[PDB]
Design an enzyme around this catalytic site. Structure first.
Site, PDB file in Angstrom:
ATOM      1  N   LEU A 286       0.769  -1.314   0.078  1.00 53.48           N
ATOM      2  CA  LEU A 286       0.199  -0.061   0.090  1.00 53.48           C
ATOM      3  C   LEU A 286       0.775   1.101   0.068  1.00 53.48           C
ATOM      4  O   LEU A 286       2.108   1.070   0.255  1.00 53.48           O
ATOM      5  CB  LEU A 286      -0.766  -0.107   1.288  1.00 53.48           C
ATOM      6  CG  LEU A 286      -1.679  -1.128   1.369  1.00 53.48           C
ATOM      7  CD1 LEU A 286      -2.640  -0.948   2.625  1.00 53.48           C
ATOM      8  CD2 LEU A 286      -2.615  -1.710   0.038  1.00 53.48           C
ATOM      9  N   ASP A 287       0.310   2.292  -0.141  1.00 53.97           N
ATOM     10  CA  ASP A 287       0.822   3.869  -0.235  1.00 53.97           C
ATOM     11  C   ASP A 287       0.165   4.559   0.871  1.00 53.97           C
ATOM     12  O   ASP A 287      -0.758   4.405   1.519  1.00 53.97           O
ATOM     13  CB  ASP A 287       0.835   4.410  -1.775  1.00 53.97           C
ATOM     14  CG  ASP A 287      -0.568   4.508  -2.064  1.00 53.97           C
ATOM     15  OD1 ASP A 287      -1.375   5.321  -1.560  1.00 53.97           O
ATOM     16  OD2 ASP A 287      -1.091   3.858  -2.766  1.00 53.97           O
TER      17      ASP A 287
END
Ligand SMILES: COC1=C(OC)C(=O)C(C/C=C(\C)CC/C=C(/C)CC/C=C(/C)CC/C=C(/C)CC/C=C(/C)CC/C=C(/C)CC/C=C(/C)CC/C=C(/C)CC/C=C(\C)CCC=C(C)C)=C(C)C1=O
Ligand SMILES: CCCCCCCCCCCCCCCCCC(=O)OC[C@H](COP(=O)([O-])OCC[N+](C)(C)C)OC(=O)CCCCCCCCCCCCCCCCC
Ligand SMILES: CCCCCCCCCCCCCCCCCC(=O)OC[C@H](COP(=O)([O-])OCC[N+](C)(C)C)OC(=O)CCCCCCCCCCCCCCCCC
Ligand SMILES: CCCCCCCCCCCCCCCCCC(=O)OC[C@H](COP(=O)([O-])OCC[N+](C)(C)C)OC(=O)CCCCCCCCCCCCCCCCC
Ligand SMILES: CCCCCCCCCCCCCCCCCC(=O)OC[C@H](COP(=O)([O-])OCC[N+](C)(C)C)OC(=O)CCCCCCCCCCCCCCCCC
Ligand SMILES: CCCCCCCCCCCCCCCCCC(=O)OC[C@H](COP(=O)(O)OCCN)OC(=O)CCCCCCCCCCCCCCCCC
Ligand SMILES: CCCCCCCCCCCCCCCCCC(=O)OC[C@H](COP(=O)(O)OCCN)OC(=O)CCCCCCCCCCCCCCCCC
Ligand SMILES: CCCCCCCCCCCC(=O)OC[C@H](COP(=O)(O)OCC[N+](C)(C)C)OC(=O)CCCCCCCCCCC
Ligand code: SF4
Lengths: 209, 155, 115, 88, 115
Positions: D42-43
């Site tokens: 994820l970011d």
């Protein structure tokens, strides 16, 4: 001043404004950078951007200034300057029946303190400057677009903003609403090069580069 | 004969609609001042049966009197949509016709006909009160020549 | 019989006019046409939200004074009695107390709408 | 009163339950100690969405100064337990 | 030289906090926006659009430019929450009536002269 077509000079007001210009520069040397009076008797005080609240407060409250009215507040965009924007305050004194112009500068990213504390009239003039030029005013009670459409992107009154803009509106029957699309002109605006290649005013000739 | 009857019924409803035009109370710019003078005593639009009413739901005609900007364009379409049919639009002045003095502005709609259909275009900047009244009487003649029922009769 | 037939005719004529209004004309119904009207822009909220009544106190007082008309309207018949001295006394007493109620609310700023 | 109190087992289950409804996380890849950035991929903004889901689940406000450190499911359990006084 | 007056954030670490705060406000607002405006899109499409707008400026390293972007973003949010915007203004982020323009060299070559 007997020439019918020429505007007569009022040298009494010119001396008075020149005298008062020195008076302000003596009292606010921390902020005043340049003072001048035009040939039609308009006094201009050019200040550092930090001096917006001190200078205007002095000019509104000092017993010998009493500039109680903010006639207008506007910006001028000069791209060739490092600080392209020029914030201009036009003040009126009812007590002394005089006018003064206060000028400062800023760029795309540097804020300028809001003068709403000094003049309640500056509330909308600063919204207009932000809306039309993109100059941010710090501590403004509520800063947002005033003239442009909702969601409008860009600042129209910048010299690099095109005259017709980038988008235009029509009504589309498929989506049953008004849409925004890239601008196409049935007739392009016709650019006229009107400048004459001969100098008009020797008095304003700039020194050669 | 059935064609004769529908022709007379068509002449009746066409007469009723052109004799009782109710413009919406809708003006945008200087052109609305000239629209006020058409209601003023000299021209007295009310004597032709033309009465302003503010509610779009009680209006038969929209007179787009002034400049239409991008900000106002959604509002214009909304009030036009909320007009019960039959509804006619009259475009008054250069701004409402094709942008006029502000054709090349970032914020102006180049003609109200991009937003709504237009039945009569009244030229001028502004059209004189007597030139708008010509457009209203030209709209009435347009309604007088409608063939709604005759076209239905032979479908 | 006459009154009932007169009422039926008035509300039958009213109903038939409404029926003609909805079935005679040509209709073209679409979503935007029937949206609520707020001068051109979409309404900001529901019309069913609370709407403050600044004359609530005067509206309650209307309930009490509207009951004085019920007590005062029999006066034309009351004046036919043989006890005029008693009837006139209680007629004026009842109206006066109705006036004292008005005076009390007026002086106590009761008829002024709330800010 | 009578409603069961909060337990670290309960907090852990609910936290892992929210993370399974998140669409960008593979359900058969979620470890109670897996890093949101390194492991799940994820970011930054994905992490912000997760924290907002936790606020909805546990019904309390997580400021940005604190939410910037919760980078794995276990750290969320510690923070929720720490702020809810659940020493169990 | 290189010493400038800040707007709100003195460094990127402080600025990114305002970016995250703004993102959380937009994220919580999309369900309300898709409801009040009666948009025919899903809450997922709206939140995807918000993400698309944020990632469009992920390469900024000047805190002042980031401060203005947050300032402009908060003005957009204020216009949407108060329903100053209309359905037309909120759907301009989706370009539903714009025909997809070519991206590859050959497709651009066939239709016109633009790069
Ligand atoms: C200068 O700066 C600016 C403004 O600042 C002023 C602006 O504003 C604006 C904006 C401008 C506008 C919105 C338009 C302005 C235009 C004007 C003309 C306004 C100027 C002033 C006026 C006074 C104009 C008209 C207004 C009035 C109040 C005149 C009064 C006279 C009238 C006839 C109005 C209505 C009166 C009556 C008595 C009723 C008539 C109404 C009807 C609907 C007709 C009858 C009704 C029926 C229902 C039919 C009858 C029969 C039935 C129902 C059937 C019965 C029989 C059976 C058998 C059933 C701009 C741009 C501007 O720049
Ligand atoms: C109460 C509601 C009753 C509803 C029932 C129907 C009532 C119908 C009777 C009223 C008829 C309207 C008056 C006739 C039109 C008129 O006078 O204008 C003259 C008009 C006047 O011409 P003009 O409109 O061009 O005038 C222009 C303005 N001037 C003249 C000043 C320059 O002349 C016409 O003949 C136009 C066509 C009229 C069509 C009338 C057809 C009616 C046929 C009956 C159909 C069956 C009835 C049911
Ligand atoms: C107080 C007064 C109250 C009473 C008022 C009475 C009014 C007297 C007028 C009588 C004539 C009514 C005809 C107008 C009907 C509306 C209309 O124009 O619809 C057109 C329609 C148009 O239909 P169309 O088929 O041409 O097209 C419709 C499809 N679109 C929308 C795409 C165009 O035609 C008809 O419906 C035919 C009308 C038949 C004649 C009327 C019959 C009923 C009334 C007389 C019996
Ligand atoms: C008794 C009821 C009296 C009140 C009727 C009010 C009314 O007619 O409104 C129309 C309302 C409003 O309906 P509407 O607004 O959806 O549209 C009406 C017309 N159509 C459906 C064709 C588009 O409709 C009705 O309820 C009509 C009821 C039937 C009345 C008898 C019809 C005879 C027609 C010849
Ligand atoms: C059984 C249903 C079929 C019966 C025939 C039919 O519905 O057509 C009648 C039609 C069909 O409905 P409609 O909705 O198509 O008619 C709308 C009105 N026109 C077409 C004239 C614009 O409805 C009518 O009863 C005509 C309305 C007459 C209005 C006069 C007042 C009546 C009370
Ligand atoms: C005007 C022309 C249009 C027709 C007018 C109405 C026609 C007559 C209607 C009618 O049938 O009248 C009689 C009927 C009952 O009345 P009645 O017999 O006196 O009741 C018994 C009392 N002992 O009356 C009734 O039942 C009342 C019916 C309602 C009224 C009819 C609609 C009135 C609108 C007429 C104009 C359209
Ligand atoms: C006749 C009655 C005469 C009394 C006055 C009636 C008109 C009301 C005037 C009220 C305004 C006023 O000027 O008087 C106020 C009175 C004095 O109080 P004060 O402190 O000075 O000022 C008000 C402070 N809130 O403040 C008060 O205390 C008002 C007291 C009166 C309240 C209304 C009751 C009136 C008395 C009944 C009169 C009718 C007799 C009924 C007999 C039937 C008994 C069953
Ligand atoms: C309460 C119950 C309501 C019942 C319905 C009432 C409305 C519909 C009636 C239509 C009947 C019909 O058929 O008229 C139609 C006929 C011809 O028919 P056609 O050409 O074969 O039509 C086939 C379909 N087209 C036309 C689409 C191809 O035209 C006429 O001769 C007269 C038509 C006008 C109506 C005359 C009445 C005048 C009244 C004046 C009042 C002031
Ligand atoms: S057409 Fe002329 S009079 Fe009418 S609004 Fe435009 S500039 Fe004003």
């Amino acid at each position: 001043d007997t020439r019918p077509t020429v505007r007569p000079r009022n040298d009494v007001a010119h001396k008075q404004l020149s005298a008062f210009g020195e008076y302000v520069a003596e009292i606010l040397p921390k902020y005043v950078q340049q003072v001048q009076v035009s040939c039609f008797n308009e006094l201009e005080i050019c200040i550092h951007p930090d001096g917006v609240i001190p200078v205007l407060t002095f000019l509104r409250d000092h017993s010998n200034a009493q500039f109680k009215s903010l006639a207008d507040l506007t910006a001028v965009d000069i791209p060739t300057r490092q600080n392209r924007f020029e914030i201009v305050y036009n003040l009126l004194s009812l007590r002394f029946n005089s006018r003064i112009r206060v000028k400062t500068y800023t760029d795309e990213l540097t804020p300028i303190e809001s003068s709403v504390p000094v003049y309640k009239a500056a509330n909308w003039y600063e919204r207009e400057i932000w809306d039309m030029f993109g100059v941010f005013f710090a501590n403004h009670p509520d800063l947002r677009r005033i003239l442009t459409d909702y969601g409008f992107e860009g600042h129209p009154f910048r010299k690099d903003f095109p005259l017709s803009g980038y988008v235009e509106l029509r009504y589309d029957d498929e989506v049953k609403r008004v849409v925004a699309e890239p601008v196409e002109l049935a007739q392009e605006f016709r650019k006229f090069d009107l400048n004459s290649p001969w100098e008009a005013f020797p008095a304003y000739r700039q020194p050669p580069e | 004969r059935g064609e004769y009857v529908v022709a007379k019924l068509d002449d009746l409803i066409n007469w009723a609609r052109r004799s009782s035009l109710w413009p919406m109370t809708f003006g945008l710019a200087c052109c609305a001042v000239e629209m006020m003078h058409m209601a003023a005593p000299r021209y007295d639009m009310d004597r032709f049966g033309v009465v302003f009413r503010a509610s779009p739901r009680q209006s038969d005609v929209m007179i787009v009197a002034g400049t239409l900007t991008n900000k106002m364009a959604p509002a214009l379409r909304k009030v036009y949509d909320q007009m019960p049919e039959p509804r006619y639009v009259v475009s008054m002045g250069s701004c409402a016709n094709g942008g006029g003095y502000y054709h090349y502005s970032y914020s102006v709609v180049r003609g109200c006909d991009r937003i709504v259909p237009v039945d009569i275009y009244v030229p001028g900047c502004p059209p004189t009160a007597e030139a708008l009244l010509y457009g209203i009487l030209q709209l009435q003649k347009k309604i007088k020549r409608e063939k709604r029922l005759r076209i239905w009769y032979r479908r | 019989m006459n009154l009932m037939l007169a009422l039926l005719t008035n509300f039958t004529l009213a109903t038939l006019l409404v029926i003609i209004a909805f079935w005679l004309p040509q209709l073209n119904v679409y979503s935007e046409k029937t949206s609520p009207y707020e001068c051109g822009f979409d309404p900001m909220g529901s019309a069913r939200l609370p709407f403050s009544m600044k004359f609530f106190l005067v509206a309650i007082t209307f309930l009490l004074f509207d009951l004085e008309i019920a007590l005062l309207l029999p006066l034309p018949w009351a004046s036919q009695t043989a006890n005029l001295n008693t009837m006139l006394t209680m007629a004026l007493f009842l109206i006066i107390l109705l006036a004292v109620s008005l005076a009390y609310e007026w002086t106590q700023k009761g008829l002024e709408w709330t800010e | 009163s009578d409603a069961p109190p909060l337990t670290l087992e309960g907090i852990k289950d609910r936290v892992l339950y929210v993370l399974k409804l998140y669409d960008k996380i593979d359900p058969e890849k979620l470890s109670v100690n897996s890093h949101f950035m390194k492991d799940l991929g994820l970011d930054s903004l994905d992490q912000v969405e997760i924290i907002m889901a936790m606020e909805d689940e546990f019904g309390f406000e997580i400021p940005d100064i604190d939410a910037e450190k919760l980078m794995c499911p276990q750290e969320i359990v510690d923070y929720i337990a720490d702020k809810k006084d659940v020493y169990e | 030289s290189t010493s400038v007056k800040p707007i709100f954030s003195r460094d990127m670490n402080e600025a990114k906090r305002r970016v995250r705060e703004l993102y959380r406000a937009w994220y919580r607002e999309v369900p309300n926006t898709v409801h009040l405006f009666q948009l025919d899109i899903s809450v997922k499409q709206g939140r995807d659009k918000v993400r698309e707008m944020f990632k469009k400026n992920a390469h900024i390293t000047d805190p002042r430019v980031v401060d203005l972007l947050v300032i402009k973003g908060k003005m957009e949010l204020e216009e949407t929450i108060k329903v100053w915007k209309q359905r037309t203004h909120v759907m301009r982020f989706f370009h539903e009536t714009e025909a997809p323009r070519p991206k590859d060299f050959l497709s651009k070559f066939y239709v016109g002269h633009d790069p």
